[PDB]
Amino acid sequence: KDFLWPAPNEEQVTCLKMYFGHSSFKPVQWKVIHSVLEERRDNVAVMATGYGKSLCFQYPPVYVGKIGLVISPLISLMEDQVLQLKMSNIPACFLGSSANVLTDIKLGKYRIVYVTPEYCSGNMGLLQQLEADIGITLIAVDEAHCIGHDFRDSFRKLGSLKTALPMVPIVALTATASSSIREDIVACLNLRNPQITCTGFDRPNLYLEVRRKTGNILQDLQPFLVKTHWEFEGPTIIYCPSRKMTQQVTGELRKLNLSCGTYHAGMSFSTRADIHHRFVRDEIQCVIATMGINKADIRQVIHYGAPKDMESYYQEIGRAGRDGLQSSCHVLWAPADINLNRHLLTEIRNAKFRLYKLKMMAKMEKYLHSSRCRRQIILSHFEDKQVQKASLGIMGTEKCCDNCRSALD
Ligand SMILES: Nc1ncnc2c1ncn2[C@@H]1O[C@H](COP(=O)(O)OP(=O)(O)OP(O)(O)=S)[C@@H](O)[C@H]1O
Ligand SMILES: [Zn+2]
């Protein structure tokens, strides 16, 4: 149910507004936050993209004014989150093998402390000292940050956190309902009677289509344009596989006077914040991207070129129709696309990582070539086997996907 129990009190709701700008907690967020704060319980939160997984670990230490330890091997992503938190008046730091920051962590100056798994393995005694002196509200581990080609490959070394900090709850975030992966998480992290919550993975308001490329950027994108200078039907994100393609597509759209912005990891935090703000305010109609985009009313997502893998594809299309209204997500691809080029995978000498990447690429290729319901493929991929009635209602209809629509011809 979407009934929050117990109800967030006045101190909790005003804190949420002051530090995060939100007026209410979402149901799965609240289940996790409450369990961490009141029950001090480990949690495995299976959360679909765009739900609000980050609040699960950022809010509790901010509310009690203690430390949330966020463990990830993605150093540049953590450095960027420090800056997002800074803009909300939440002090955060990255702690690594950091003389001026460790002294300040011991003084209570930081709410969120980002560390790599490598750092944790060598400094358990230091983390025990922080828990004894200040208190650690929670430890957060995101399974998705293992994109090192496995949760075990990325976080194997964390099988000592729970033994060093037995009373500190761990919140493990995952973007898949796979029982095998949940078992891998519980076992690797030594979770004690964890609370398991899941959001479900369908987004019924997204029409899914896959179409082959025609041999020219403007020729491929022309069908998405409506007359006025021509423009898209609504706010649109175009995902490209490389910074070069992002600039090529941007250059072509600008020949048609489309209002565009680019969004990639080569840009600074401040330049990305400006594009995001302008897209949110509808001062630009299209963002061409290669670090998410949160906007309520994205009406169209286009992957210009085959996506990398099902997980990133799903996260990317998930930015669409966050308001619940009808949106469309189209993949324009060709077998020669760089994300299906087996050469760089075939170059890997190691047998294990060459097999993992080849398996991911094969799953993506099978989805692109499929004549089956695209929605069912996605739901099955994320092992969301208990399909919701809403999903059964959308599937098979003209608004589900291109294959469902052509079966109705
Ligand atoms: N309680 C809330 N109410 C309204 N918005 C929220 C709430 N919690 C989080 N959000 C927003 O939801 C968006 C998604 O949250 P994130 O924790 O960044 O999840 P994410 O799956 O990494 O998002 P994407 O998919 O990468 S855009 C962010 O803009 C949050 O600010
Ligand atoms: Zn379908």
Residue numbers in the entry: 525 to 621, 624 to 673, 677 to 757, 760 to 821, 826 to 944
Q: What sentences appear in the manuscript?
A:
The Werner syndrome RecQ helicase WRN was identified as a synthetic lethal target in cancer cells with microsatellite instability (MSI) by several genetic screens. WRN is a multifunctional enzyme with both helicase and exonuclease activities and has roles in various cellular processes that are crucial for the maintenance of genome stability, including DNA replication, transcription, DNA repair and telomere maintenance. Dissection of the helicase and exonuclease enzymatic activities of WRN using loss-of-function mutations showed that WRN dependency in vitro and in vivo in MSI cells is linked only to its helicase function. WRN dependence in MSI cells was linked to WRN helicase-mediated resolution of secondary DNA structures resulting from large-scale expansions of dinucleotide TA repeats that otherwise result in chromosome breakage.
While HRO761 and ATP analogues both bind at the D1–D2 interface with overlap in the D2 residues, the relative orientation is rotated by approximately 180° due to a conformational change of residues 728–732 (Thr-Gly-Phe-Asp-Arg), a flexible hinge between the D1 and D2 domains. An overlay of the D2 domains of ATPγS- and HRO761-bound WRN shows that the hydroxy pyrimidine moiety of HRO761 mimics the γ-phosphate of ATP and recapitulates coordination of the hydrolytic water by the catalytic residue Gln850. The domain rotation induced by HRO761 splits the ATP-binding site in two and displaces the Walker motif, resulting in mixed ATP competition through allosteric binding of HRO761. Validated WRN inhibitors (for example, covalent hits, ATPγS) were around sevenfold more potent in this assay compared with in the ATPase assay at ATP KM, whereas false positives (for example, compounds losing potency after repurification) were equipotent in all of the assays.
